[PDB]
Each structure stands twice: as C-alpha cells, then as structure tokens.
C-alpha cells in the first residue's frame, strides 16, 4: 500500500496531470510488476487538494467495475495497469471482432460500476469511452476519477464555479446551461457512452463530429440543439431497443432519466 519512489522505474507515458507506466522494481533487475502511476506537473494547493480528493475517493471504491487503487508514493497515485488501455481505442482496434452481445456486456458492466458509484454518493462527471479501461475481451472498468465529487448527505447535485474543460458533447443540458452536476447528469453521459459503444467509437460519427455537423458560441449552439429536442442519430445497425435506452438517458429533465439501477436489468435482458 506504500510504494517507495526510488523503486518505481519509469517506462513510458500512458496519457492524461499524467499517467505513466512504471515498473515497481525493488530488485532493480527488470522483473517487478507493472503499475499505472498518476502525478501532477503543476503546483498550487488547489490542484494538489483536488488530487488528494481523487486519491481518497478511489481508495474507498471496491468494485470489479472500477479501476483498482494500489497505493500512494510520497505525490503519486498507484493503480493497477490495464495494458489493453481505454475502451475508445480498443473498440476502434477490434471493431470487426466484437458483436452486439459483447457491446451489451460492456454496457451492463459500466452501468453496474455507475450504480455502485451512485451508492457511494459519487458523481463521476467525465464518463466517456476514453475514460473506461479494458481489463480483458470480456471485462471493462471505469477509470479517470480526476473530476469526481462526493455529494453531501443533504444535497443530490453540485454546482461547479467555472464551466467544464472537457469536450462539450458528453454534458447534460443542465451542466451546459447551469454547471449543475448529479448522478442524473452521469446517466446522460452514459447515454453518450452507449452511443460510443454502438458506433465502435468511429471518428466519422463520433459525438463531436456528429453534433458539429448537426450544429454564436458552439456551447450555446449545442445547448440550443438539445433544447429543441434534437439528439445524436441512432448508430448504423444499432438494435432498436438500445437506441430507445439512449433516448431515455437523454430525457431533457434530470428527474425523467432512468436510474442506473433501472437501466442494469434492461441491459442484462437484451444481452
Ligand atoms: C485512450 C487511451 C488510453 O488507453 N487511455 C487514456 C490515457 C490514460 C488515462 C489512464 N490510463 C490507463 N491506462 C492503463 N492502465 C491504467 N490504469 C489506471 C489508469 C490507466 C490511460 C488510458
């Protein structure tokens, strides 16, 4: 649970702070285990405080569908390494091999991870295929908890001061208009993840490419589009039942969206 800095050997960059692939090699002979290590590159007590908040959240999550916390190095967050990487690239790389049943299995696993996060009063805020990791051909896990927040016991939503820095195409209308985040805005984002799964993350029909094609500031143009009732089109060859669940996740009002507890059994039935 406590990793000595001197024994964490740098291998390569895994992506964005930053996540590096390291070998925890106390024997110094290149035989030690591989770990994914996150660290900040910018000071400031706020980014440092935000980082400490993320570590406390992840350490307290225990689920087969959430990336495993391993420990800290005093500074660095150590997690399990998943060499298959993000679901977005995996889907692009394996499109000709994964069928609808497999996509439904991933959808069900993400939904179960989200149901659990909601039970912990945790709002993820950045659910997207690029933030989901692949453990194996038949198992995915939610990762990237850097924007996650815990809801106080007496309030089921949070208001952020500054608008998001993430690509705008995953945000719920209330997040775009009023910077409001909740477990219900995570359901909206999950509807975008179902879309990503069913397009195999094809860049030509991606949430950014398609919304920009359908689309004055861009944020305001997208908010206008959504408020009119316009939505992303059903992915090519998408099962009708799956497209109907996406539309429910995209209900204009947060209270009308199904909960992850309601979504789970429906995804399992389709699978
Ligand atoms: C889509 C590219 C990709 O594979 N990723 C995005 C950049 C980082 C973020 C976290 N991460 C990662 N990769 C593998 N094992 C990990 N364990 C914790 C975080 C991990 C990359 C995934």
Swiss-Prot record:
Catalytic residue list: 126 (proton acceptor)
Domain Protein kinase: 8-271
Outcome, altering residue 87 to S: In T(-)B(+)NK(-) SCID
UniProt subcellular location: Endomembrane system; Cytoplasm
Transmembrane segments: none
Range of residues in the leader sequence: none
Residues given in the record as ATP binding sites: 14-19, 38
Post-translational modification: Tyrosine phosphorylated in response to IL-2 and IL-4. Dephosphorylation of Tyr-157 and Tyr-158 by PTPN2 negatively regulates cytokine-mediated signaling.
Phosphotyrosine, modified sites: 81, 116, 157-158
Tissue: In NK cells and an NK-like cell line but not in resting T-cells or in other tissues. The S-form is more commonly seen in hematopoietic lines, whereas the B-form is detected in cells both of hematopoietic and epithelial origins.
The protein's assembly and partners: Interacts with STAM2 and MYO18A. Interacts with SHB. Interacts with CD69.
Domain notes: Possesses two phosphotransferase domains. The second one probably contains the catalytic domain, while the presence of slight differences suggest a different role for domain 1.
Similarity-based family: Belongs to the protein kinase superfamily. Tyr protein kinase family. JAK subfamily.
Known disease link: Severe combined immunodeficiency autosomal recessive T-cell-negative/B-cell-positive/NK-cell-negative: A form of severe combined immunodeficiency (SCID), a genetically and clinically heterogeneous group of rare congenital disorders characterized by impairment of both humoral and cell-mediated immunity, leukopenia, and low or absent antibody levels. Patients present in infancy recurrent, persistent infections by opportunistic organisms. The common characteristic of all types of SCID is absence of T-cell-mediated cellular immunity due to a defect in T-cell development.
Role this protein plays: Non-receptor tyrosine kinase involved in various processes such as cell growth, development, or differentiation. Mediates essential signaling events in both innate and adaptive immunity and plays a crucial role in hematopoiesis during T-cells development. In the cytoplasm, plays a pivotal role in signal transduction via its association with type I receptors sharing the common subunit gamma such as IL2R, IL4R, IL7R, IL9R, IL15R and IL21R.
Name under which the protein is recorded: Tyrosine-protein kinase JAK3
Species this protein is from: Homo sapiens
Origin organism lineage: Eukaryota, Metazoa, Chordata, Craniata, Vertebrata
Section of the entire sequence shown: 815 to 1099 of 1124
């Amino acid at each position: 649970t406590i990793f000595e800095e001197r024994h964490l050997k740098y291998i390569s960059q895994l992506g964005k702070g930053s996540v590096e692939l390291c070998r925890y090699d106390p024997l110094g002979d290149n035989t030690g285990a591989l770990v994914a290590v996150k660290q900040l590159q910018h000071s400031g007590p706020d980014q440092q405080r935000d980082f400490q908040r993320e570590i406390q959240i992840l350490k307290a999550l225990h689920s087969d569908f959430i990336v495993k916390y391993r420990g800290v190095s005093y500074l660095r967050l150590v997690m399990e390494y998943l060499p298959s990487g993000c679901l977005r690239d995996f889907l692009q790389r394996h499109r000709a091999r994964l069928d609808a049943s497999r996509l439904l299995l991933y959808s069900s696993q993400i939904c179960k991870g989200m149901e659990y996060l909601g039970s912990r009063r945790c709002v993820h805020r950045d659910l997207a295929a690029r933030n989901i990791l692949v453990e194996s051909e038949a198992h995915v896990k939610i990762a990237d908890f850097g924007l996650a927040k815990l809801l106080p016991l007496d309030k089921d939503y949070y208001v952020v001061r500054e608008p998001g820095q993430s690509p705008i195409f995953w945000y719920a209308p209330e997040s775009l208009s009023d910077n409001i985040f909740s477990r219900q805005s995570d359901v909206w984002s999950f509807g975008v993840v179902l879309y990503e799964l069913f397009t195999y993350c094809d860049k030509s029909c991606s949430p950014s490419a398609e919304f920009l094609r359908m689309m004055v500031p861009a944020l305001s143009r997208l908010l206008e589009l959504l408020e009119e009732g316009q939505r992303l089109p059903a992915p090519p060859a998408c099962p009708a039942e799956v497209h109907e669940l996406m539309k429910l996740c995209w209900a204009p009002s947060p209270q009308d969206r199904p909960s992850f507890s309601a979504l789970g059994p429906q995804l399992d039935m389709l699978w």
